[PDB]
Each structure stands twice: as structure tokens, then as C-alpha cells.
Amino acid sequence: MACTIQKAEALDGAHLMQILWYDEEESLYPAVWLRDNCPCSDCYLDSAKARKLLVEALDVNIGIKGLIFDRKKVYITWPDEHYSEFQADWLKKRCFSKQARAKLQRELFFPECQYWGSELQLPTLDFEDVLRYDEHAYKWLSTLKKVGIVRLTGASDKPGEVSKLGKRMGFLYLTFYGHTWQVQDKIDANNVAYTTGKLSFHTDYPALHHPPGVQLLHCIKQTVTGGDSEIVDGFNVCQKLKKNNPQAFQILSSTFVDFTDIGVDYCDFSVQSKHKIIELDDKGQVVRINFNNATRDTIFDVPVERVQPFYAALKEFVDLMNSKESKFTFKMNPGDVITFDNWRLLHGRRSYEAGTEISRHLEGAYADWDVVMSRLRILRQRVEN
Amino acid sequence: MACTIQKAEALDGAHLMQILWYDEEESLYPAVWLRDNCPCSDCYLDSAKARKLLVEALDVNIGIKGLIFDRKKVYITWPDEHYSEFQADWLKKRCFSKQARAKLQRELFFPECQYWGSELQLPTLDFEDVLRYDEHAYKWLSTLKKVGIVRLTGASDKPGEVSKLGKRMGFLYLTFYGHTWQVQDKIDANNVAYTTGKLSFHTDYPALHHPPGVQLLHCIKQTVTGGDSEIVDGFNVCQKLKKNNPQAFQILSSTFVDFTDIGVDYCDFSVQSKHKIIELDDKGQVVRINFNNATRDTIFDVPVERVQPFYAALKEFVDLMNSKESKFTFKMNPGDVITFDNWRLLHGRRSYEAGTEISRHLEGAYADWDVVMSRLRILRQRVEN
Ligand SMILES: C[N+](C)(C)CCC[PH](=O)O
Numbered sequence: 001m002a003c004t005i006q007k008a009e010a011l012d013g014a015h016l017m018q019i020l021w022y023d024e025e026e027s028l029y030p031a032v033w034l035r036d037n038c039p040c041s042d043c044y045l046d047s048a049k050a051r052k053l054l055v056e057a058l059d060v061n062i063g064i065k066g067l068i069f070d071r072k073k074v075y076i077t078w079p080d081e082h083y084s085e086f087q088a089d090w091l092k093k094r095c096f097s098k099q100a101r102a103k104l105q106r107e108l109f110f111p112e113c114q115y116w117g118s119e120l121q122l123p124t125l126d127f128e129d130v131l132r133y134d135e136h137a138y139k140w141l142s143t144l145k146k147v148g149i150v151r152l153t154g155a156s157d158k159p160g161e162v163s164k165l166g167k168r169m170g171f172l173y174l175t176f177y178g179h180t181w182q183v184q185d186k187i188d189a190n191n192v193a194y195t196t197g198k199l200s201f202h203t204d205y206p207a208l209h210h211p212p213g214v215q216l217l218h219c220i221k222q223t224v225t226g227g228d229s230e231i232v233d234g235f236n237v238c239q240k241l242k243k244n245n246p247q248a249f250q251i252l253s254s255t256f257v258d259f260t261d262i263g264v265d266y267c268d269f270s271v272q273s274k275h276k277i278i279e280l281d282d283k284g285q286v287v288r289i290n291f292n293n294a295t296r297d298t299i300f301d302v303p304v305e306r307v308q309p310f311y312a313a314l315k316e317f318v319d320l321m322n323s324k325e326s327k328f329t330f331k332m333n334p335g336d337v338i339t340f341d342n343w344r345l346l347h348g349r350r351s352y353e354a355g356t357e358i359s360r361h362l363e364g365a366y367a368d369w370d371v372v373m374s375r376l377r378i379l380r381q382r383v384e385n
Numbered sequence: 386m387a388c389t390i391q392k393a394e395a396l397d398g399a400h401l402m403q404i405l406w407y408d409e410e411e412s413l414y415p416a417v418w419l420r421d422n423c424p425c426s427d428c429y430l431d432s433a434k435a436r437k438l439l440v441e442a443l444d445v446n447i448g449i450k451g452l453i454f455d456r457k458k459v460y461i462t463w464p465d466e467h468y469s470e471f472q473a474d475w476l477k478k479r480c481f482s483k484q485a486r487a488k489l490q491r492e493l494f495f496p497e498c499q500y501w502g503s504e505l506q507l508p509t510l511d512f513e514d515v516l517r518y519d520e521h522a523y524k525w526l527s528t529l530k531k532v533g534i535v536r537l538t539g540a541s542d543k544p545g546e547v548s549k550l551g552k553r554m555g556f557l558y559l560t561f562y563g564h565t566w567q568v569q570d571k572i573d574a575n576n577v578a579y580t581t582g583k584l585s586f587h588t589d590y591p592a593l594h595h596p597p598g599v600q601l602l603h604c605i606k607q608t609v610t611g612g613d614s615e616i617v618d619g620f621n622v623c624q625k626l627k628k629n630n631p632q633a634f635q636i637l638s639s640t641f642v643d644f645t646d647i648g649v650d651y652c653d654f655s656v657q658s659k660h661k662i663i664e665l666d667d668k669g670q671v672v673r674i675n676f677n678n679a680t681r682d683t684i685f686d687v688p689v690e691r692v693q694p695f696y697a698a699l700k701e702f703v704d705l706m707n708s709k710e711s712k713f714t715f716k717m718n719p720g721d722v723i724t725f726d727n728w729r730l731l732h733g734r735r736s737y738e739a740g741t742e743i744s745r746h747l748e749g750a751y752a753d754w755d756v757v758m759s760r761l762r763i764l765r766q767r768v769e770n
Pocket residue numbers: 177181183191193203204205206207261292295364
């Protein structure tokens with residue numbers, strides 16, 4: 001009744017097609033969009049699922065010359081005699097009503113978000129299950145998207161596990177620190193991470209204009225002298241900051257901060273960027289946090305009078321993150337892997353003691369959100385069908 | 386005289402340090418920024434060139450307790466007895482005056498831009514020279530940044546050349562189409578590019594939220610039946626559109642368009658994104674164009690009344706690109722490689738004839754701008770020193 005055509009007609013100087021569906025609802029389709037989206041073999045390359053039609057061939061003032069319909073299809077003639085057929089269900093899905101458009105966006109982009117603080121129950125799956133079963137990998141990625149973190153247990157205590165997960169997703173995101181990298185204490189460390197010191201809450205790689213979307217950390221070796229992990233839900237913390245201190249929020253969501261990274265690892269590098277620490281979209285929603293205190297540059301490109309208030313705002317933000325209501329702490333054991341949203345969470349680590357042998361060793365890697373969301377879409381189709 | 390300290394003193398309740406330089410100019414440095422940027426081994430990890438100091442250790446209302454200076458350094462005591470030394474030239478570089486800040490940003494980010502139309506003289510270097518000499522690679526990357534395109538001549542007519550350039554930069558940007566990819570006519574093409582058809586002006590991969598910054602195309606085999614290249618300076622064309630048709634500019638710079646790519650290549654994929662075709666920064670400057678007509682989705686997430694005006698605006702934009710004043714056309718020969726800014730230029734190709742043997746073959750790859758700018762910074766230092 002909802003996908004069955006009761007009537008189709010050309011309206012508004014034939015610039016619009018209206019479908020009355022068998023449930024009595026009406027949908028409206030611009031003529032120019034119909035022509036633009038003709039599925040015929042001239043207009044559309046089926047093997048690529050791509051449009052061949054050029055903008056140059058599209059008359060933007062086009063109207064429907066003629067139209068007939070049955071219950072499942074519309075058949076349209078255009079003024080230059082081009083001919084097009086459209087399927088009812090194809091049309092229904094792409095209905096321009098707000099409700100239809102929003103429904104479809106949800107299906108494409110999986111916007112459901114669960115904010116958390118110290119009450120978090122760390123979502124936890126089995127490593128091998130996720131590698132072997134689509135039902136488990138689907139749970140893994142959908143929970144990663146929704147909650148921002150998933151722990152996988154039961155990996156080996158050897159290198160190569162994050163690469164298996166990289167492959168399960170598709171491929172890992174190569175950076176100057178390599179395809180994967182070893183978090184351990186290193187002589188002449190090229191990064192604070194490769195010492196025994198504490199890492200305060202941070203996101204990884206704000207020195208890049210496109211920071212890693214997803215980070216993977218596999219515990220190979222753990223120390224009893226410290227090295228606990230801590231995480232915080234940056235989107236939750238931003239929400240609290242906007243409420244508690246709107247001026248601080250405004251400063252952090254409007255001030256461009258310089259980040260830097262210079263050294264040698266996978267190859268030699270000298271990286272520079274600018275980001276707002278709180279990055280809003282065009283509707284004012286926080287979409288990414290970009291903050292690492294280690295790699296924030298000495299160079300600070302703001303007028304002198306904005307400097308101290310920036311620092312005062314950053315301090316408020318960090319105090320909220322550290323609050324016992326926001327923070328979630330846990331300790332990784334050999335064989336655990338955490339995978340999290342590096343655009344949303346901030347993460348850190350407690351200090352531990354140095355010594356002559358390596359007492360602590362993680363293997364890390366990054367992935368891109370477009371790569372993960374692709375895999376998520378494919379898994380959903382496989383598991384639902 | 387400009388980098389030599391004549392006087393240094395604490396002002397404004399000791400919250401500010403003022404340096405009077407020997408040229409009589411004065412610079413001002415907030416106390417909190419000085420403390421934040423203490424270079425001592427407690428505060429700063431020299432092997433990483435990174436800050437160890439935590440936001441949590443920083444008192445945002447800090448003032449200078451004491452200060453002495455000589456011509457080359459300031460020596461500061463803080464209220465908790467921490468102690469810091471700062472070098473004069475280090476201070477001068479990071480001066481908070483607008484002129485000093487702008488000068489340094491230019492040095493970091495190479496903002497110089499040369500807009501062009503059909504008068505372009507295609508910058509051209511020798512392939513092997515660029516691989517062998519820093520002076521040539523430096524010219525290559527700086528011209529790529531400034532002009533948006535450089536042709537390299539004298540490569541071989543075999544696969545593997547774009548990878549050599551990838552290595553010269555650092556590393557290539559892996560996508561679902563592989564590390565490198567072959568542009569040629571293919572049975573069951575997964576992409577319009579892999580047919581003999583015409584490609585209208587487009588940027589590559591707007592289906593990704595982070596499209597490739599730089600694209601490399603190496604002509605292995607060329608056809609005499611067509612296959613000419615065309616390029617346009619998207620930043621130049623956007624400037625003309627804003628002047629000629631502000632309403633069209635506004636629509637394209639504010640309307641989110643859905644892009645899609647589904648299929649199998651390096652692995653199986655189902656990619657979706659949203660972009661404004663003209664992407665402005667926070668000051669209203671165009672920073673990226675995101676437009677491929679083949680991969681623009683059938684799904685169009687706007688109210689029905691915005692649809693036809695969007696198409697009318699897109700048409701104006703494409704007509705400007707096609708204008709004989711904007712367009713630059715040329716033909717690649719075996720052994721040529723073009724490298725261009727895929728955020729700024731749009732590119733295309735004339736149709737050619739199909740047949741039973743492959744008459745036309747390019748090898749392509751992508752790179753990230755942060756990777757290229759890193760290499761550019763390193764090369765400049767090597768060539769200037
Ligand atoms: C060195 N690793 C652990 C890869 C982190 C790099 C990103 P950070 O923001 O310096």
C-alpha cells in the first residue's frame with residue numbers, strides 16, 4: 001500500500017511529478033532530478049552504479065512531456081524524446097519529505113550515539129569470534145560507532161593482531177609512525193608515548209589535518225607498576241562544558257590551535273596543522289575533538305589578549321575530563337585489544353616505572369572512519385540477509 | 386638589533402613579559418604561555434621536540450616571580466620556584482604581533498597561490514631530476530602548492546613510476562582502488578574512469594569525507610583517437626561564480642550533496658559521504674571543491690523546493706568551468722606524469738574509441754597534503770642549507 005502507485009501525474013507546469021501511494025500519502029519529485037537520475041544505459045553505467053549523464057546534458061528547466069504509470073513503475077517521455085522508467089520502491093525510498101530523507105540518512109550513517117561517563121560498561125567481544133563471524137564483527141563495528149569503544153579479548157600476546165583486525169575492516173591508515181607501531185619505552189623517544197611517563201587525556205594525531213578516526217591498541221605486555229588506561233567521552237564532556245561554561249566552550253570551539261610533529265620514524269617528517277580543539281559542524285554539533293597537549297605547538301597564532309583566556313578555557317575542559325563522573329579507568333592485559341573512536345574519545349595512560357627490560361608493550365594502528373563505515377554497511381546487509 | 390634584547394621586564398601584575406629589542410621594537414609574551422612553553426627537561430622532551438608539561442600543572446593565573454636577562458636570553462623564576470630560560474631568537478620568532486604571526490604562518494603553510502585560466506604555462510620538470518635532486522623536488526612540490534599542477538616528463542612507459550614519486554614524497558594514500566590503479570577500458574567497469582567515455586570536470590573521490598589532496602597520473606599508453614586532458618583552476622572559477630552569480634555561489638557553498646561509491650576493487654566497498662561542492666573555511670575562503678558527477682548519489686537530502694535551484698546553480702558552475710577563458714587542454718604522451726592539487730583543480734578527459742586491445746593506459750595514485758607539505762618543509766630546509 002505504501003510502495004504501490006495509485007496515481008502519478010505531472011504538475012506545476014510539468015516541473016514536478018506527484019505520486020499518490022496506495023496508503024493515500026503523496027510524494028513529490030522534481031522533473032530535473034528525475035531526468036538527472038534516469039537509470040537507462042545511456043544515462044547510467046550499471047556495472048559501476050554511477051551516473052554517465054553530464055551536467056552539460058541536463059536542462060534545468062525541463063518538464064515532463066508525458067507520463068503513464070502502473071502500480072510498480074512510472075514511464076516518462078521528455079521533451080527531446082529521451083525516455084525513462086522509474087520503479088516505485090526506488091521512488092519511495094528517495095521521497096523528499098523530511099521523514100523519508102531522515103530515515104534514509106540514519107540507515108546510511110548510523111547516527112545513534114550513547115553518551116557515557118564513569119558508569120560505562122566496557123563493551124567486550126571475543127577477538128577470534130569477530131574475525132570468524134559476521135554477526136560478531138557487525139556487533140563490533142556498530143558498537144564502536146554508537147558507544148565509541150569496544151574491547152576485544154582473547155587475542156594472542158604477539159604482534160600481528162591489529163593487522164588481522166585491519167584486514168577484517170579492509171585496510172589500516174598509514175602514518176609517519178608506520179602501518180602499525182610499538183608503544184614501549186625507547187631510547188631517544190621520538191614521541192612522549194614511547195616513554196614511561198603519564199599521558200593525560202588526548203586524541204591521537206591532531207598534528208594531521210585529518211586525524212585517525214579509529215585507533216586500535218593491542219596489549220602484548222603489561223606492567224604491574226602502572227600503565228592503567230583512562231578514557232572519557234569527549235562529546236559528553238563538551239556537552240557539560242557548554243552548560244557549565246559557555247564562554248570556555250565558545251573559545252575552544254572558535255580558536256585555531258597549531259599542532260606540530262617533527263622527527264624520524266617510518267620516514268622523516270615535519271608536520272604542522274591548525275584545528276579548533278572543539279570542532280563543530282554547520283549546525284553547531286560537536287563532530288571532532290582535536291587535542292594533544294604534547295604536540296600542541298609553542299607557536300600560538302592568536303592576538304596576545306586571547307592567550308590567557310584560551311588557557312583558562314582549556315584548563316576548565318581538562319578539569320571536566322578528569323572529573324570522577326566523566327572518567328573511566330581500566331587496565332589492559334596481554335591479549336586485550338581496544339578499538340575506539342579517536343574523534344570522540346580522549347584517552348590516556350598512567351605512568352609506570354622504567355627499567356632495563358621492556359615491561360610494557362602495546363601494538364597500535366589507525367583506521368579511517370570511511371573504511372570502517374563501509375565495512376559496517378556491508379556487514380549489516382550480510383547479517384540482515 | 387632585532388633579535389638582541391635591550392630590556393625585559395614583567396608587567397601587568399607580572400602576567401606579561403615585555404621585551405624591548407635593540408631595534409626599539411617591543412614584544413609582549415603572556416606569562417602563562419611562557420610557563421606552558423618552558424624548555425627545561427621536566428617540561429619538554431627534547432628527543433621528541435614535545436611538551437611533557439600537563440595542562441593540569443599549569444596555573445592559568447600565573448605571574449612571573451622574578452626575571453633577569455642578558456642580550457640573548459631571559460631567565461625567569463616562577464612562584465613555585467620552577468625556573469625557566471628562553472632564548473632571544475626563539476622569542477622573536479614567536480612574537481604575538483600580527484606581522485610576526487603572519488610571517489611565520491606563511492613559512493609553515495606556503496599560502497602563495499597563482500590563479501590561472503587558459504593562459505596557463507604548464508609547469509614542467511624532468512622526472513629523473515626530481516627523483517635525484519633536492520633542488521628539483523623542491524621546485525616540484527612548491528610549484529604544485531602554488532599553481533596546483535606540475536607535469537613531469539621523461540618517465541618510462543611502464544608501471545611503477547608513480548610509486549617512485551610516492552616514495553620521494555614519503556608514501557602514497559591507499560584507497561579502495563588500491564595503492565596505485567590502472568586507468569584503462571575494462572569489462573564490467575567498476576568506475577566510469579575505466580571506460581572510453583568522456584569525463585567532465587570533476588575532483589576525484591568526493592565519496593570520501595577526506596578526498597585525496599594530490600593526484601598523480603602517469604601516461605603509459607596514449608591513443609590517437611581522443612583522450613586529451615583538460616584542467617581548470619577551481620579556486621579561480623569559484624571566484625568568478627561569486628562575482629557573476631552570488632546566489633549560485635551561496636547555494637553551492639551551503640548545500641550538502643550526497644556522494645556514493647559501491648563495488649569491488651582492492652576490496653569490497655560501500656562508501657557514502659556528504660560535502661558542500663564549494664567548501665569554505667571560517668573566513669569565507671574556498672578551501673576545497675568536492676564534485677564528481679558520476680558519484681553524486683541519486684539520494685539528494687534537501688527539501689523539494691531547493692532541488693531545482695541547486696541544479697541551476699551547478700549548471701552555472703559547470704558552464705564557467707567549460708568556458709574557453711577557464712579551461713586548459715593538453716594531451717599526455719607515454720612517459721609524462723601529471724601531479725596536481727585534487728582539492729583545487731577539476732580535471733577531465735575527452736572520449737576515445739574502444740577496441741579489442743588496450744590503446745590507452747594511465748597509472749594513478751593519490752597522496753595526502755600533510756605528507757606532501759611535510760616533504761616540502763624538509764626539502765626547503767635542505768636546499769636553503
Ligand atoms: C606515536 N603514536 C603512538 C603513534 C601516536 C602518534 C599521534 P600523537 O598525537 O603524537
